[PDB]
């Protein structure tokens, strides 16, 4: 949860994400507190879209497990909602971050991206 240390991890995310405009992935400013699949103008996968529709709001706590394995997280979320059929597809985000400390730190960074 060291946002400064998260800066170095965030450089990887900058391959596809910008704070304020969409790119390969959606704009991330204000992602902490945002309903999944709702960045204006971005076309999400059904998996991410359906997760937000089922109520997923990204928080400082749940983005951490998400980054370890985006597909597993979103599939598990929808399955827990009794919506496993809406989780058959995969996310467009083909990146994963195995290290837990790196995930905690980059999510602390995200929380400062207002
Ligand atoms: C390109 C190879 C990517 C990299 C590197 C990272 N992300 Fe990404 N991300 C990408 C796409 C194409 C998408 C849309 C997913 C879909 O299925 O539509 C995403 C999405 C996210 C989200 C969800 C945002 C939302 O509005 O619901 C988050 C929280 C996210 N990405 C975070 C994130 C971070 C912190 C990264 C560096 C650790 C990162 N992504 C890398 C593409 C790519």
UniProtKB/Swiss-Prot annotation:
Disulfide bonds: none annotated. Heme c binds at residues 13, 16-17, 93. The chain holds residues 26 to 139 of 139 of the full protein. Keywords: Electron transport, Heme, Iron, Metal-binding, Photosynthesis, Pyrrolidone carboxylic acid, Signal, Transport. It comes from Rhodopseudomonas palustris (strain ATCC BAA-98 / CGA009). Cytochrome c2 is found mainly in purple, non-sulfur, photosynthetic bacteria where it functions as the electron donor to the oxidized bacteriochlorophyll in the photophosphorylation pathway. However, it may also have a role in the respiratory chain and is found in some non-photosynthetic bacteria. Belongs to the cytochrome c family. Binds 1 heme c group covalently per subunit. It comes from the Bacteria. The modification Pyrrolidone carboxylic acid is found at residue 1. The keyword Electron transport applies. This is Cytochrome c2. One of its GO terms (biological process) is photosynthesis. GO terms for molecular function: electron transfer activity; heme binding; metal ion binding.
